Amino acid sequence: AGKDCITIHSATFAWSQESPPCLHRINLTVPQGCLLAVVGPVGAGKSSLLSALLGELSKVEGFVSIEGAVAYVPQEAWVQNTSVVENVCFGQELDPPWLERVLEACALQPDVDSFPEGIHTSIGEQGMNLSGGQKQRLSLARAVYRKAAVYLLDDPLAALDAHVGQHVFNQVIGPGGLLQGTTRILVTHALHILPQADWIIVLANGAIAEMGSYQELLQRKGALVCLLDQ
């Protein structure tokens, strides 16, 4: 097995110290360099699990340790009142060939050619209007550009069309992609990428119900199969 990257140890979380817990006693380590899929019904706590790893919830009990710099792609993206390149670099030092590769992998190179200023086109309030899919892919591109070691991905490709979502997942997130050496935690509502993940975590009511690979949880006729039938 690979080295321990994320360790979540007897960890219980809530929105406040006095609130009833929203995540119940997580006990989990993620190996370094893997793609972990987090699935479960609506309200099972998939999004709050990433927020808990961001340190945004109040930890009632337990301990969390994460090895390496962490990048986050929210479910609802938003872009700054600036140009395309300033949105991707976002303070990071500019490296043109790496920017081109990131834009390419995130299915943004056609969109950039169509813009008048190219990568220097203003977006946001004063800038040009973007679609929901373009903002979401610009959001993922910003996280990829940072070259973090851990990626928390709150179903960033959900609304995208079929072939563009395939382009982005295949080039960025999945096996062989730009993030292949990183530890990726991918919450996903759609379930066709599950055979490409290394491990699957199924959550129920803010707790872990099942963990295994795709074939493991499939031959097991349990929570993942029940959700696939749903």
From Swiss-Prot:
Domain ABC transporter, chain residue ranges per copy: 6-230
Name of this protein: ATP-binding cassette sub-family C member 6
Free-text tissue specificity from the UniProt record: Expressed in kidney and liver. Very low expression in other tissues. In testis, localized to peritubular myoid cells, Leydig cells, along the basal membrane of Sertoli cells and moderately in the adluminal compartment of the seminiferous tubules.
Localisation: Basal cell membrane
Residue ranges that the UniProt entry lists as topological domain Cytoplasmic: 1-230
Consequence of substituting residue 197 to P: In PXE; affects protein expression and trafficking
Phenotype for residue 211 to T: Found in patient with putative diagnosis of PEX; uncertain significance; loss-of-function mutation; localization comparable to wild-type
Organism: Homo sapiens
Family: Belongs to the ABC transporter superfamily. ABCC family. Conjugate transporter (TC 3.A.1.208) subfamily.
Annotated effect of mutating residue 86 to G: Found in patient with putative diagnosis of PEX; uncertain significance; loss-of-function mutation; localization comparable to wild-type
Consequence when changing residue 50 to P: In PXE; affects protein expression and trafficking; expression is reduced to less than 10%, when compared with the WT protein
Post-translation changes: Glycosylated.
Residues that, per the record, bind ATP 1: 40-47
Disorder this protein is connected to according to its UniProt record: Pseudoxanthoma elasticum: A multisystem disorder characterized by accumulation of mineralized and fragmented elastic fibers in the skin, vascular walls, and Burch membrane in the eye. Arterial calcification of infancy, generalized, 2: A severe autosomal recessive disorder characterized by calcification of the internal elastic lamina of muscular arteries and stenosis due to myointimal proliferation. The disorder is often fatal within the first 6 months of life because of myocardial ischemia resulting in refractory heart failure.
Result when mutating residue 40 to C: In PXE; affects protein expression and trafficking; expression is reduced to less than 10%, when compared with the WT protein
